[PDB]
Write a structure and sequence with these properties.
The complex is a heterooctamer, with four copies of chain A, two copies of chain E and two copies of chain F. Chain A is mainly β. Helix content of chain A is about 0%, strand content about 45%. Chain A is elongated. In chain E, the strands form three sheets. Chain E has a four-stranded antiparallel beta sheet with strand order 4-3-2-5, with no helix packed on it. Chain E has a four-stranded antiparallel beta sheet with strand order 8-7-6-9, with no helix packed on it. The radius of gyration of chain E is 14 Å and the shape is globular. By secondary structure, chain F is mainly beta. Chain F has one domain: Aligned Prism (Vitelline Membrane Outer Layer Protein I, subunit A), CATH 2.100.10. In chain F, the strands form three sheets. In chain F, strands 4-3-2-5 form a four-stranded antiparallel beta sheet, with no helix packed on it. In chain F, strands 8-7-6-9 form a four-stranded antiparallel beta sheet, with no helix packed on it. The termini of chain F are far apart. The chains are: A mainly beta, E mainly beta, F mainly beta. Chains C and H meet through strand 1 of C and strand 7, strand 10 and strand 11 of H. Strand 1 of chain D pairs antiparallel with strand 11 of chain G. Bound molecules: beta-D-galactopyranose (GAL) (4 copies). The site of one beta-D-galactopyranose (GAL) has 8 residues of chain G, from strand 7. Chains E, F, G, H: It comes from Artocarpus integer. Chains E, F, G, H: Belongs to the jacalin lectin family. Chains E, F, G, H: This is Agglutinin alpha chain.
Chain lengths: ~15, ~15, ~20, ~15, ~130, ~130, ~130, ~130
Amino acid sequence: QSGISQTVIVGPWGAK
Amino acid sequence: QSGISQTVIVGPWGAK
Amino acid sequence: QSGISQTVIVGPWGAKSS
Amino acid sequence: QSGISQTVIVGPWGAK
Amino acid sequence: GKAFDDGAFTGIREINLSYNKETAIGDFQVVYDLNGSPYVGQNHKSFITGFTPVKISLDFPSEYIMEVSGYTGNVSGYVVVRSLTFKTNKKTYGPYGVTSGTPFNLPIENGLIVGFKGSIGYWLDYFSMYLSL
Amino acid sequence: GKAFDDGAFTGIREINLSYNKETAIGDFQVVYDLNGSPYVGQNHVSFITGFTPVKISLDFPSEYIMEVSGYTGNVSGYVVVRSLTFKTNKKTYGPYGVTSGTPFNLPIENGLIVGFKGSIGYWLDYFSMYLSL
Amino acid sequence: GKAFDDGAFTGIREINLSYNKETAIGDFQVVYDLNGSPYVGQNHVSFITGFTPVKISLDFPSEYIMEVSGYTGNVSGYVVVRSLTFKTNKKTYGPYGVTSGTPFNLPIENGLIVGFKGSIGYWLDYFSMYLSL
Amino acid sequence: GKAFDDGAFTGIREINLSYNKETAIGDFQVVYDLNGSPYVGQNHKSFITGFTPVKISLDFPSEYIMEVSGYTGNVSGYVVVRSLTFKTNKKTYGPYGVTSGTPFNLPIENGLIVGFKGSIGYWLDYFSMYLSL
Ligand SMILES: OC[C@H]1O[C@@H](O)[C@H](O)[C@@H](O)[C@H]1O
Ligand SMILES: OC[C@H]1O[C@@H](O)[C@H](O)[C@@H](O)[C@H]1O
Ligand SMILES: OC[C@H]1O[C@@H](O)[C@H](O)[C@@H](O)[C@H]1O
Ligand SMILES: OC[C@H]1O[C@@H](O)[C@H](O)[C@@H](O)[C@H]1O
């Protein structure tokens, strides 16, 4: 792994 | 706390 | 709930707190 | 990335 | 309708649903992954019949859902989920049902859908999804 | 537009955005909570002016966002976020902007929005949200 | 020894282990909770017998483990887990085994133990725990 | 001692602590990563002086802590943290302080340390760690 914390991310909404 | 694990829940979509 | 995010916390090690 | 959910894992304790 | 809650698992292996080209989504059942082993969820069936069955077999764990979209609308006086579409990192499954009404969509940039809950009477009334890393 | 990514924090205290009721959302800035202390996020501004400012001050931590909804659609040739509405456990803020086009909505049964990322040119091109327990 | 990995679940309902006052921990089995339904984990047994069985029945979900402690040491030339103690918000179970060797302890301020993995030969060689909110 | 709680961040860039080969750990300060940018945490200092400073600069984000170990024990009639050792995927830092008393160790198979909390009077009374994926 990397030393960076992760989080759930939803989206995007809008332009592709 | 309760001994029950939690998780993110999104929704609902549909009837209210 | 509350508007504050939570994370797992392990410990403490050292003087007793509970 | 993986279709497999992950969890924090601590240890091991005992034999290396 | 009759509410259901499958709970949270390790991943998704297969989705089985049924729909009617003139009404909405009917039956819904999921085969989850539970720590590397398939776990068959309870079949949540409509109070009626006459639906067309669909089997979505994912190539777990390399293939996973990245977006769920659909439409909600009135059917016989009831607001229900009329259509569903599942997009994975490999292909698009759907749309299944009627693409009319109010659209909705849940794209996921990071994370996984690991469970479903909702209610089904004559049709799928509503549903929610469990998300996790 | 110019992409931005605020990252994840502990919660949301205030949202400052600007919009034009005849076009779309413009500026976007968030005051996050960072472990009990306010953290002023970078102000992501539109390339143009003429927007109406709005300050959404939440009664943190008792008040939090339970649903985000809005509309996307064209403004000239570009697909952008035309309108946004924020619903908390206390009040509904908005809608702000053109309430026409393709709707989208994200209701949260369990969890919290803890960050934003997206892109802004003349208008808010797109955006995503970080979710956490 | 023979490695095992139960994986992660919703919680813990019961722990069944065995020990010997002169050696170390032997058998290990857990009855987990899986979205409200008990799930019997595989019984991980020692290659030998002569152990004293212990059943720890928790008052799920009001009672849960807050700290796991124990000792690791040499037994017949093998480094193994010689003792275990489980402290919940209601009581302390143990110590089971011999409290000689190098101690270890895992207190939890926030979160839950939701799974176990490890290895067992004549005795419990080592183990790890899955943690989650 | 005086309690402190830095909270949770996105990673760890640098740890600054001080110790005394005859007593225990004194001062403790951490430079966290906050969504790609360094964030200097408050310096938690001992009520007294005479400690030897130590700077642990990690090669973020390629280098991260995989195990924290140490010793707790009595000093002047108080139970305190006498020694600490930080093992990363690249190097071992420490032990710093007196390696006498009761040992403790926290190996991490999956996850990251993203924050610290504790208390400091003459010495570090106790400490806990925030964990995340
Ligand atoms: O599916 C839509 C509706 O179906 C009916 O059978 C049921 O009585 C309603 O409560 C609602 O579920
Ligand atoms: O916001 C709509 C558009 O604004 C323009 O200024 C930019 O060049 C486009 O890339 C797009 O962002
Ligand atoms: O349990 C301690 C030992 O037990 C033996 O039976 C096994 O062959 C060893 O590898 C070690 O596991
Ligand atoms: O650090 C050891 C001790 O230091 C003293 O200064 C303080 O009054 C105690 O509460 C304890 O913290």
